[PDB]
Design a protein around this ligand. Structure first.
Ligand SMILES: O=P([O-])([O-])O[C@@H]1[C@H](O)[C@H](O)[C@H](O)[C@H](O)[C@H]1O
Ligand SMILES: O=P([O-])([O-])O[C@@H]1[C@H](O)[C@H](O)[C@H](O)[C@H](O)[C@H]1O
Ligand SMILES: [Ca+2]
Ligand SMILES: [Ca+2]
Ligand SMILES: [Ca+2]
Ligand SMILES: [Ca+2]
Ligand SMILES: [Cl-]
Ligand SMILES: [Cl-]
Lengths: 255, 260
């Protein structure tokens, strides 16, 4: 019922999920990738919800979501594995993403970096935490002093060049959730994804609010958690400059 | 010589273990915040290096050190190459994704190599006669990776963009950890197909020789030649199945260099 109660349940389900994943990985089979691991984690969470919060609905990657509307009171958004490519190719640098919305308002968020056993969580009224230790607003980062992260394969190269020249350096973890959390931790100045699904960014809203980060569309607007949009999550001090570079000279999209 | 590889290895491992007692403090000191990529400090680099110099004074006093933060005979018997922090930018900006690199050469022959991923407490080591290990578990030759099925890693800011584009189109995807030692180990583990560094120093690649030999990796110049461990050269470390294709792309259409 309370946020703490729901949080305690989710944290224990995530803990138990450590006991399932090594096996799924040992038998890993695959099919824009999708494994058994994605599907099984998702199904288990569906069953978890049937069992504890049976009014609650799920918007997730591996299910049809036709039934999900503007007015659902209790909504979870899930990415059961974000970074499937990294899971398959590296068995590292992937995460589980969850977010609970109450009447459209972010209340709980989770990014579980399972390979490193690092649970990032955010709780409206309490704050954000990594394995329990409170996260603080990161230091201010101007773009020239910041590392930035984005997919350079989906942008035109003049714009990529401008991002390179204006920033301290460039890195890529390769999972939206984890690259986002590096912004949250102050390790990156900003992460960009030019075409995310609602589940790629759903947890990030509450993190951005509680840690004073900017999270907007690439036009600087509020994002609908129900609909993807081109997006950025950014340190407050470099947000404007990134958007200016992205939108200059007819924009960032490949010619 | 005189000490066996096991004896030397034991001492390096115990030094590296005591280094866990030093690093948290060095990091606690150290916040800025306006020097660019090329102009970084730190005291962490310098202190780790000084301590290793004391370690050698103390145990292997014949041994010499070629290191970043500090060569008169061509033919040194006992040589260590060190990068006390590889990934200084990541240390400063992220406090993650950096490593300590050490490589011992006996009469110019790689005998011991270490890449210590300290933030994750993962010690990658290679020992001539034993094999390569991660925290003790033996590393095997990685599966074959064709370039189209492989993640590759390189600095995209230092190559011309057409060649960067060609590398994107031909590989499965692109990632960057941002420390030569760690990006290289991802090749060693089979996580990446290849890592490129177009201008490394001897310390950036010194450990990698022995890893590439023991795990059947290709490590060459970008012209496909053997590298002198004493002298940097533009380099690639690669899975055997994607090495040729990477070099072909890099050298195609007049080459990879940005301002040519
Ligand atoms: O497919 P998936 O691994 O869940 O999600 C992807 C990752 O977050 C990745 O970093 C990329 O940028 C894509 O935009 C996402 O679709
Ligand atoms: O300065 P440092 O962090 O020891 O070493 C650097 C890192 O390995 C980095 O990834 C980069 O590619 C440079 O080539 C190196 O100079
Ligand atoms: Ca996914
Ligand atoms: Ca995703
Ligand atoms: Ca260094
Ligand atoms: Ca280095
Ligand atoms: Cl700025
Ligand atoms: Cl190939």
């Amino acid at each position: 019922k309370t946020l703490q109660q729901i949080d305690k349940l989710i944290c224990s389900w995530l803990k138990q999920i450590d006991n399932v994943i090594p096996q799924l990985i040992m038998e890993m089979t695959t099919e824009d990738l999708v494994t058994n691991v994605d599907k099984q984690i998702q199904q288990q969470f569906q069953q978890f919800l049937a069992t504890y919060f049976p009014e609650h609905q799920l918007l997730a990657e591996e299910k049809s979501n036709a039934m999900i509307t503007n007015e659902i009171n209790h909504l979870w958004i899930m990415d059961p594995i974000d970074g499937t490519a990294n899971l398959v190719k590296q068995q590292e640098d992937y995460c589980i993403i969850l977010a609970y919305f109450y009447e459209g308002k972010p209340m709980l968020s989770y990014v579980y970096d399972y390979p490193h056993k690092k649970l990032y969580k955010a709780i409206r009224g309490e704050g954000a935490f990594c394995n329990g230790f409170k996260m603080e607003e990161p230091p201010s980062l101007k773009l020239e002093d910041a590392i930035i992260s984005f997919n350079a394969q989906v942008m035109n190269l003049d714009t990529v060049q401008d991002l390179f020249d204006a920033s301290f350096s460039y890195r890529l973890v390769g999972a939206c959730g984890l690259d986002s959390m590096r912004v949250a931790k102050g390790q990156f100045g900003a992460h960009i994804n030019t075409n995310p699904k609602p589940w790629d960014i759903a947890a990030q809203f509450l993190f951005a609010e509680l840690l004073n980060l900017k999270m907007t569309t690439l036009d600087g607007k509020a994002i609908d958690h129900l609909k993807g949009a081109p997006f950025i999550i950014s340190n407050k001090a470099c947000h404007e400059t990134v958007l200016k570079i992205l939108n200059a000279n007819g924009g960032y999209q490949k010619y």
